[PDB]
Amino acid sequence: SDRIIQITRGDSTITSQDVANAVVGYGVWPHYLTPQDATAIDKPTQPDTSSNRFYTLDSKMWNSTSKGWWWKLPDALKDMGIFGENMFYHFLGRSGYTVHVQCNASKFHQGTLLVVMIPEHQLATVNKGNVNAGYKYTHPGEAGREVGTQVENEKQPSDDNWLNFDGTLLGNLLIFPHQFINLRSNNSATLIVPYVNAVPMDSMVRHNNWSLVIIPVCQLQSNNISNIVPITVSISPMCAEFSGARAKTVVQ
Amino acid sequence: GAQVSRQSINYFNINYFKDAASSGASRLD
Amino acid sequence: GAQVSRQSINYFNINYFKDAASSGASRLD
Amino acid sequence: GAQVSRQSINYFNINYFKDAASSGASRLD
Amino acid sequence: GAQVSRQSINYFNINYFKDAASSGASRLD
Amino acid sequence: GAQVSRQSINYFNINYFKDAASSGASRLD
Amino acid sequence: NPVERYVDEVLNEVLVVPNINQSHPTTSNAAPVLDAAETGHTNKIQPEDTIETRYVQSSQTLDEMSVESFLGRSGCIHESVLDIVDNYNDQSFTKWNINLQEMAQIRRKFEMFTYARFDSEITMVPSVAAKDGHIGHIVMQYMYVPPGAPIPTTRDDYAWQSGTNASVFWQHGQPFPRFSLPFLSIASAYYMFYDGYDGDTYKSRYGTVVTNDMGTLCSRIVTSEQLHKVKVVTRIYHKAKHTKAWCPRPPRAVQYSHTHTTNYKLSSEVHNDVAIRPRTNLTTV
Amino acid sequence: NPVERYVDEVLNEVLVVPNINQSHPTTSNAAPVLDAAETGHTNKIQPEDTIETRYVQSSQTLDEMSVESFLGRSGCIHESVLDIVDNYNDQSFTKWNINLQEMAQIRRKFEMFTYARFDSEITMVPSVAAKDGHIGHIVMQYMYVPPGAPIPTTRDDYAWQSGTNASVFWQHGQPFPRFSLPFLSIASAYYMFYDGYDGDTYKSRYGTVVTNDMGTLCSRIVTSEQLHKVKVVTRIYHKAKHTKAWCPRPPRAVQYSHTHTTNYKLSSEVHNDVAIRPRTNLTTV
Amino acid sequence: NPVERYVDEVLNEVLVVPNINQSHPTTSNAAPVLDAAETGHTNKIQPEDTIETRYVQSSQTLDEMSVESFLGRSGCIHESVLDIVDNYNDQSFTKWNINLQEMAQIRRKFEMFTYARFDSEITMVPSVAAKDGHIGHIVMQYMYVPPGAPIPTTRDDYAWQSGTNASVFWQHGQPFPRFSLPFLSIASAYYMFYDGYDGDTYKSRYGTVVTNDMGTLCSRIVTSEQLHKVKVVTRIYHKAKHTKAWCPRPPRAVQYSHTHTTNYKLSSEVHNDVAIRPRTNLTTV
Amino acid sequence: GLPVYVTPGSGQFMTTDDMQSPCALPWYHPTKEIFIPGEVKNLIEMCQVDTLIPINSTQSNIGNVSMYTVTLSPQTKLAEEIFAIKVDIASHPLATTLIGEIASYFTHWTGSLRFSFMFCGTANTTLKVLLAYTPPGIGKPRSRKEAMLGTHVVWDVGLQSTVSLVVPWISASQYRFTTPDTYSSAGYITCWYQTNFVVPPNTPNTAEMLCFVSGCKDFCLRMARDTDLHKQTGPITQ
Amino acid sequence: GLPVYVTPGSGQFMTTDDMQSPCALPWYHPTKEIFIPGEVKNLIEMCQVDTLIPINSTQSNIGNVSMYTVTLSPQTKLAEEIFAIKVDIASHPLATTLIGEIASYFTHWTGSLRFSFMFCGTANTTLKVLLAYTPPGIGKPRSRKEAMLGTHVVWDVGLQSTVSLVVPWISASQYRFTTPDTYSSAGYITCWYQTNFVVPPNTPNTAEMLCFVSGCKDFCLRMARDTDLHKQTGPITQ
Amino acid sequence: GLPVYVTPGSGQFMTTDDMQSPCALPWYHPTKEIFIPGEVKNLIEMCQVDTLIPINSTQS
Ligand SMILES: Cc1cc(CCCOc2c(C)cc(-c3noc(C(F)(F)F)n3)cc2C)on1
Ligand SMILES: Cc1cc(CCCOc2c(C)cc(-c3noc(C(F)(F)F)n3)cc2C)on1
Ligand SMILES: Cc1cc(CCCOc2c(C)cc(-c3noc(C(F)(F)F)n3)cc2C)on1
């Protein structure tokens, strides 16, 4: 059956009986850094199965007024087992991911979520001159950011989903690795993305490579609204490797 | 690039630019 | 220095300076 | 196009334009 | 006068003046 | 016209005008 | 044939588009027009699959749509002004923190990609305006000061000696100056966007300003003070060569505000801030 | 011999005319001089058929009568004026809706054919008139704005950045600017005439204006305001290259009135509107 | 392959740096990290010896660090001034005792070696300032007077005939003058430093002034007196070609005072005379 | 020296010329190029990817995600019209789509367009719709009968949520202008109810539909130009 | 003559161009080149030679040889810090070293650095010290425990007076800027007492230590520029 | 560089010259040429066709 899937990573296995295939970002499967592209000279540490496993973030509630949600990687995993520990004890890190978004309802529910993985999603601020988004706002952790809620401080980033929070039109996000969760067809989305950057490895703490953006393009509707419909995200690092070991970095 | 011919009287027919619109008048017949 | 080709229609592909950044637009494909 | 001769001392006798009136003074005899 | 090399990619290494001081930067190694 | 020599290091000794008085300094010895 | 290769470049027929083949009426349970956009893939259906087509020999080429062609045109990136008003020593020189963020036209094109690697061709168009009548003999000096090198603070600063920096001297009446620059990043590609900081505190900087330091362009009128005042405006043009781009993205939809940031302004009536034109209704073409 | 081919081009003997052969007195019922113009064909009789000719070796060539030669000469097609009178910002730039209809000399030549396909060579002759004395340092910018691109509305409009459009910058004292353009139509040939409309109502437009949109030529004095006012007139010249023409037609017989239309004026004494000169009578040579 | 040699020059990959090989944990009585600086030799230990390294393929090249590259950039070495104030005959010509000691930037670079042998490329940047309005037709003459040749004492001195000396005539509006000079010393190399005298008494001269006599550069405005006064400043640039250097030395740490001498000034607070920045203490990064 | 003849054009600066020039950084060796996923070599690769059409961009919807959806529902009259737009790649409802934005950097276009539609009602919601393309030379169809006489697809909603309508390249000339120019106006796309929107009881009585657009294998753009879908009215500062 | 097209750039003077030019002294024959010891062909040869770091350059020490030595002595508290400096090749305690001065003539650097230390106490003075390198992304270590978690060497003073610590090239990008620019800030080098400075009776209770620096086989500089470690504020006269 | 001698005529603009020049639309590919009846290659083809003489062109 082409609508079933089982994904095994380390000691974790995820299943779905209503998928819409899977997407491999830019057609490139994640792989370890080769000696021809490498630059840092010390031997990397490769945690393997203790880090390349599915980590489930906090669930979100989807209702008729939801405007969307976003998370940044690797930030969202900063407190996730061994993977999290490794990104703070090392200067450099490198990794790919398997993002699995879950959301089921019923054959009497309707709604559509656009699930996108954006590389270098540099957020914007609105009507605030040259003041840019502050560090703590773009590093929410596993809780991510719920569009349309925050208390307006100055370094607060844009909350306009139709402008991709960056000055570009939502309808064109499909140019990035993506999938849709159309309740009448599937109850999950699966994106496998490789490491994408202009350098072979980077700081896991000051730089977020990917951003997971989930926008409900078609309002959630049904005749049984009291029944809460959550959205759950499970992310698994792939080929994670770290370099430049030292004491553990403490942020903020 | 140009087309060199020989007989000796060589006809170096040069085309200095990379576009066809750039060359001079066409040959007749 | 330049790359000369023959077939006769020679394609003298000259590179007038000693740096790669100096040459014109790249070939496609 | 021009007439190349060899003996080695080559006599590259170039004609830069496409008309006979364009060339320089004629040879004698 | 200049040194012509072939392999085809010819490297016409011209020296436009009659003195060594006149040429450009030297080769390395 | 000019005298081309080979050994490969070609010495293109050009004479751009049709009169002997036009060329540059003479060779010595 | 490397000569057959050349004929294609002259005619611009290196990348040809496929032909349309004749198709026929069909009746089957293979329904190409049906699919699932949820997969994230575009339906690969072609015209031969939905209508009965004739055979057509395509002549179109994609050469002009190549990345090399798209980013390979000189556009303005800066307009330097040296306006002599009342103090020659202070007004005859200036500096500019180099970047490709100040002019919307070329900025938008490069920002249609996340990363790009290319060499640059800089062309300068200087124009001397005679405010009092004559222009005299104007000689200009444009000097590239890489990050770290000393920046001149007077028109006679020792830094103008240019013992190691690259300087281009232009004389009025001579052709426009021009030169090439090789790919300059300390990384493998330039960042068109950067979701990162130069630290981990509330005061750390965000964006490309962190990764795109290109140095400073210092210029001055070499000619010493003249009786008649002039206003010299030098416009800098940039063109990419030997280009490569990665991860395409949505085009900028609203006006730019500042350099190195995606920040934008929004008015009370947003339809005025985007190129989208309001439709009367769903059926009014 | 491609070298034998070349000798013919230098001497202009590529298209030779036939010789006249010797003929003799004849008496037959084959009457070549008789025919029927009703057929729509020209009698193909030659001189050897009507008189007794001698043998003559023709040396004439038709090279110069070729279409390439006939349309291959630069002619003026426009005279752009930038006259600084009292407002530099408003008078230092202008625009022109490109076409080959404004100058009678070249227009008449191209209109001797119904369709024509060719590449173009544009040469510009700028001349700066000093109205107050000095001219300063004049730098001009000519920009080609294809249909659809933004047209500048001020001398500092962002469109002058020319991020994608083609611009030519000229500096006073340097050679006349020149460049080539490839055949630009969306069709296989340019329409010299078009018996069609852009719709089917009483208000639809008629003629070549419907098919010959070439875009706009925007120009400006790059130099900023100077004390002395100048009047810059830039004359544009056009020449066809690699030409092909189809379906020849009658030459324009009366003066032209407007662009893209065959409309004409007629006075009360029509013989003054055409080149025909009144004859005294049938027998007055 | 002399063609393979050429590809390396275009890409600048003639001098490649070695790769880093993978290393492993070790336990032995061979202790590379230990040594004795007293020997005067640098410990030749590499990263593979102290930590466990991975295999990395180095792409860096040392081409740009070559002596040819380091000293092969044009830098200013002199700024000649001809300022017409009130006497044309006295102010329209001048002379300069040639040397590479007056401009700190290039002087410091060459002085990082004890001896150097190279050819020179001199480029001149003349700029005419109109003090009264017009500049007329400025023609300059730069003449090299080797030691011993007659030095002109008036603008019409017979020495300007330049019957044997080399002179370069420049006309305003033409490109910047330039020419090459072969290695000029009477020795095998130029002395950047010289611990010697031109005699053995208390009045003998010390240093490079004894060995570096290069002659004089005499220049004049060829044009005869004009109504309007001008100030012509000619800046001389030098670049080394086909270079060789011997015995490297410590870089100049304090400002230069005079030509041909290592003399220096020292203030009461010496930390202001050197580039060293005072540290708060040993542990304050 | 060699006698030369300086030709017209010499000294000029053409922004689209292709000349060589001396390098300001001699001997400099660029950073080694590493592999990065997602390389693009030709913009055609971007025109072949679907992006949403802000088809419902009425003034009250712009600035909302609802500007991208079309609402469907049980009809009381038969064969009702759902939507209608011009098919011109750079005309306005689709000018801001990715292919429309790219087409706006060129003067000419040619080739076939691929329009896709995804139904977003419940799994128990049924519907049949008629998507039609009307070639030029006539006004937009005023009824389903008039529309179905042209190129069209009858779409039956089911397990597969998306359908595609190909607008074949049907033109007099090999290319058309990308900017709104009547002569090269490509026609219309209209959508009508083929049957009706039917649902069982206790199910939402309305549903949304998403619209996509991309180019087929024969799509192609020509003659680069600056875009009018973006501008700069003041200095962009530090 | 040959038709030519003068290109942009013509007539300009680029200080880094590489053209040929006529010789002002024709027929001149340069003095024969003799052999001289010490020829240098590449500046890398100078970066590979150790030079002293003015590590103790406090205001009271500058202008004295003592600015080059670090004093060691018997400690009363365990694991005390001895010194701490940034590892950036052109940052300040080491900007005036030979490799630092040369790096200051270039914009980019890469490769591993070699730091050496020579103990100068008596032959009867013993000591164990910990030399550590802290990769970026964290503050300088505040204790020996925090420091030893990074790259480090434990040095035991003995017959061999000198030890070397290699600061491996550990960076995100292939190169870094030589000028003090946070993004490409390479980390720190700290020194701590591993045990203590012990001496027998009748022996000096303090001793000095010298610090050296040079580059490893992978060291390399790029993009020539003028230095800011030297200036000229007035004319240099005869 | 190569020593050159600029000849008289340089820089001038002759309306009948035959030089090459850079193309303002690089990479542009012209529309494919289709067959059209009636092509003319030389004006002589038009001189060989009969046309009426307005021989009785008196003013009236
Ligand atoms: C991303 C990205 C890539 C770049 C490089 C932009 C090019 O910037 C320049 C320019 C415009 C000129 C010079 C320059 N080099 O030499 C001279 C001069 F001195 F001749 F002007 N100017 C150097 C750089 C890096 O900026 N951002
Ligand atoms: C029929 C037919 C064919 C044509 C083409 C006429 C040529 O028109 C032009 C001209 C004169 C100049 C440019 C032009 N391209 O670039 C520049 C500039 F910016 F350098 F001026 N001008 C473009 C066209 C299409 O017009 N009608
Ligand atoms: C050590 C060392 C090496 C040198 C040579 C410096 C170059 O000095 C010159 C210069 C700058 C110009 C000329 C020169 N030759 O001809 C002309 C001119 F007449 F054209 F100016 N100038 C000759 C020398 C030796 O000085 N010190």
Coordinates of C-alpha atoms and ligand atoms in Angstrom, one line a residue, chain I residues 77 96 98-101 116 118 120 122 124 141-145 162 165-169 179-185 189-192 212-218 236-238 260, chain K residues 24-25, ligand 3:
Chain I
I77 CA 56.6 56.9 -3.6
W96 CA 63.7 65.2 -6.8
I98 CA 65.0 59.5 -6.2
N99 CA 64.5 57.0 -3.4
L100 CA 61.9 54.6 -1.9
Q101 CA 62.1 56.0 1.6
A116 CA 66.2 42.7 -2.8
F118 CA 64.0 43.5 -8.9
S120 CA 60.6 48.5 -11.6
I122 CA 56.9 53.4 -12.7
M124 CA 52.7 58.6 -13.1
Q141 CA 58.3 66.6 -19.3
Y142 CA 59.8 64.1 -16.8
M143 CA 63.5 63.5 -17.2
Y144 CA 65.7 60.9 -15.5
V145 CA 69.1 62.4 -14.7
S162 CA 67.6 65.2 -23.3
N165 CA 68.8 60.9 -20.8
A166 CA 65.4 59.3 -20.9
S167 CA 62.5 61.7 -20.9
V168 CA 58.7 61.0 -20.9
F169 CA 56.4 63.6 -22.3
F179 CA 57.6 52.6 -18.2
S180 CA 59.9 49.9 -16.9
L181 CA 63.4 50.1 -15.4
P182 CA 65.7 47.2 -15.1
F183 CA 67.6 46.3 -11.9
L184 CA 69.9 49.4 -11.5
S185 CA 72.4 48.7 -8.8
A189 CA 71.1 43.5 -5.1
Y190 CA 69.7 46.7 -3.6
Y191 CA 70.6 47.2 0.1
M192 CA 67.5 47.7 2.2
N212 CA 71.5 53.9 -2.8
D213 CA 72.2 56.9 -5.1
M214 CA 69.6 56.6 -7.9
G215 CA 70.0 60.0 -9.5
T216 CA 67.5 62.8 -9.9
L217 CA 64.0 63.1 -11.5
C218 CA 63.7 66.5 -13.1
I236 CA 54.8 58.6 -8.8
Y237 CA 53.9 55.0 -8.2
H238 CA 56.3 52.1 -8.0
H260 CA 68.0 56.3 4.5
Chain K
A24 CA 63.4 53.5 -20.3
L25 CA 66.9 52.0 -20.4
Ligands
LIG3 C1 66.9 50.4 -3.5 C2 66.4 51.2 -4.6 C3 66.0 51.0 -5.9 C4 65.6 52.1 -6.5 C5 65.1 52.5 -7.9 C6 63.8 53.4 -7.7 C7 63.3 53.7 -9.0 O1 63.7 55.1 -9.1 C8 63.7 55.6 -10.4 C9 62.5 56.2 -10.9 C10 61.3 56.3 -10.0 C11 62.3 56.8 -12.2 C12 63.4 56.7 -13.1 C13 63.1 57.3 -14.4 N1 63.8 56.8 -15.6 O2 63.2 57.7 -16.8 C14 62.3 58.5 -16.1 C15 61.5 59.5 -16.8 F1 62.4 60.4 -17.3 F2 60.6 59.1 -17.7 F3 60.8 60.0 -15.7 N2 62.2 58.3 -14.7 C16 64.7 56.2 -12.7 C17 64.8 55.6 -11.4 C18 66.2 55.0 -11.1 O3 65.7 53.2 -5.6 N3 66.2 52.5 -4.3

